[PDB]
Design a protein around this ligand. Structure first.
Ligand SMILES: Cc1ncsc1-c1ccc(CNC(=O)[C@@H]2C[C@@H](O)CN2C(=O)[C@@H](NC(=O)C2(F)CC2)C(C)(C)C)c(OCCc2ccc(CN3CCN(c4cc(-c5ccccc5O)nnc4N)CC3)cc2)c1
Lengths: 88, 149, 115, 104
């Protein structure tokens, strides 16, 4: 079971399954090595990105009805910039 | 006559529209010229038994934002003829949006189009925010895919 | 060209208003969709299939202008309207069912007005 | 059937999934593979409450309603150092800025 580590700008370490991190085109490119440092993505944004990775893998091509991916207004802008940079 | 349109079959078909999404759903019918027709909306978690015809083409959107929705895990719904009375089921759900698209939906729901360029974000994102979900763009995208296959 | 007796015009109007005003058990006015035909530009498919198009607007106009000379003439245009709606929309549609209830409403109102 | 979790300790967060039927010990075995510390050097917690090895995740309160892909349940983690477990310590994530005026 392959895992990768994603480090935020504030030094938080996020350990996710490799296959889940490959959701991001940027991450997949950086792994083309199992540790990626994001000097401009804070931990409150990176944790939310990792939750999207789980959501995407679990619900893409599912038969169980799909719930909404919730985003608080306070994180919306930073989350948009990270999704744009990460190509996910 | 375009690629994506309804055929004037005159062959009756009973359909069940079931909104299994947290959104107010706009059923869209493509007419005999492939032009999109808005139909009465469905509140979240409601179902209606409706009358349609064989070879008629349907799309489903969020009634307020026109964000694209799925029906039986695909984009287009075409009822065939009922086999021995049996109505055809159309299960409407949320697709798995990209993180970018979902973030764009949320920021569009909170900010007025005039204030998009007042946001402290990467400048490329202004054109992304301005490029609102459009039924016509998606129909071109789906037509291009149909001709490709 | 000569007008109908006022009693006959009164009878024709009393029947048609009973058909137009009719509401089912759920309070829904069944004639709603049949008051005015869609245009040729809006629905050309209707005109491709339906040879003698008619709506409750053209029916009321025909009473007013004395085009119907008997209650039978009025009946033929109401049955025509309902049969046009049936032919176009086909069985299994609500409009088909509503047009069948309106047929029955007309014949009961004509029986009541003539008693 | 499936439960989605965040196993957190200090500045470390592990995103993992398991079954509602799997035990707390089987979860300690997932951590062992990642962080190279045996289950007996681990203490797992739900809301500052110690989780027993023999208990299933469902029995601990982790369900398809409380532990979702988009909203995972948090599991605390304390390590043993020189035969003494440290105090359970989880570093909070960073805070977002104040909501912009146009977003109000
Ligand atoms: C409840 C609910 N919740 C969520 S969605 C929904 C819902 C779902 C279905 C319907 C009704 N069904 C349809 O419109 C189906 C669907 C699609 O296959 C196309 N289609 C058709 O009938 C076409 N017919 C055909 O292809 C054929 F008939 C040739 C076979 C068409 C559009 C009439 C050309 C509905 O309906 C309520 C909403 C709704 C939908 C459409 C319209 C616009 N109409 C169009 C024309 N119409 C008619 C008038 C008369 C008529 C008038 C005067 C005198 C005599 C007459 O016969 N006759 N027939 C008509 N269809 C009035 C206005 C208005 C309201 C609501």
């Amino acid at each position: 079971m392959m895992y990768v580590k994603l480090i935020s700008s504030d030094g938080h370490e996020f350990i996710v399954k490799r296959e889940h991190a490959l959701t991001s085109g940027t991450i997949k490119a950086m792994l083309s090595t199992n540790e990626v440092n994001f000097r401009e993505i804070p931990s409150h944004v990176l944790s939310k990105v990792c939750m999207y990775f789980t959501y995407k893998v679990r619900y893409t091509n599912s038969s169980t009805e799909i719930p909404e991916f919730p985003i608080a207004p306070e994180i919306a802008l930073e989350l948009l910039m990270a999704a744009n940079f990460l190509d996910c | 006559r375009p690629v994506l349109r309804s055929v004037n079959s005159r062959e009756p078909s009973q359909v069940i529209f079931c909104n299994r999404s947290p959104r107010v759903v706009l059923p869209v019918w493509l007419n005999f010229d492939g032009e999109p027709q808005p139909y009465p909306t469905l509140p979240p978690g409601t179902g209606r038994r409706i009358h349609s015809y064989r070879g008629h083409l349907w799309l489903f959107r969020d009634a307020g934002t026109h964000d694209g929705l799925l029906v039986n895990q695909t984009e287009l719904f075409v009822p065939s003829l009922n086999v021995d009375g049996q109505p055809i089921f159309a299960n409407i759900t949320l697709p798995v949006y990209t993180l970018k698209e979902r973030c764009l939906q949320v920021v569009r729901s909170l900010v007025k189009p005039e204030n998009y360029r007042r946001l402290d974000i990467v400048r490329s994102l202004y054109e992304d925010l301005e490029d609102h979900p459009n039924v016509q763009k998606d129909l071109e995208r789906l037509t291009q895919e149909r001709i490709a296959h | 060209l000569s007008p109908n007796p006022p009693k006959l015009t009164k009878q024709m109007n009393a029947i048609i208003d009973t058909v137009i005003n009719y509401k089912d058990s759920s309070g829904r006015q069944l004639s709603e969709v049949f008051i005015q035909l869609p245009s040729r530009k809006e629905l050309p498919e209707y005109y491709e299939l339906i040879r003698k198009p008619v709506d409750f607007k053209k029916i009321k106009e025909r009473i007013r202008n004395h085009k119907y000379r008997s209650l039978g003439d009025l009946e033929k245009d109401v049955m025509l309207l309902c049969h046009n709606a049936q032919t176009f929309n086909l069985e299994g549609s609500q409009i088909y069912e509503d047009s069948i209830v309106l047929q029955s409403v007309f014949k009961s109102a004509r029986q009541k007005i003539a008693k | 059937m499936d439960v989605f979790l965040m196993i957190r300790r200090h500045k470390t967060t592990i995103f993992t999934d398991a079954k509602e039927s799997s035990t707390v010990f089987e979860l300690k075995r997932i951590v062992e593979g990642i962080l190279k510390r045996p289950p007996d050097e681990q203490r797992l917690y739900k809301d500052d409450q110690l989780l027993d090895d023999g208990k299933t995740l469902g029995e601990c309160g982790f369900t398809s309603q409380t532990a979702r892909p988009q909203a995972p349940a948090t599991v605390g983690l304390a390590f043993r150092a020189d035969d003494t477990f440290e105090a359970l310590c989880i570093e909070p994530f960073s805070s977002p800025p104040e909501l912009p005026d146009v977003m109000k």
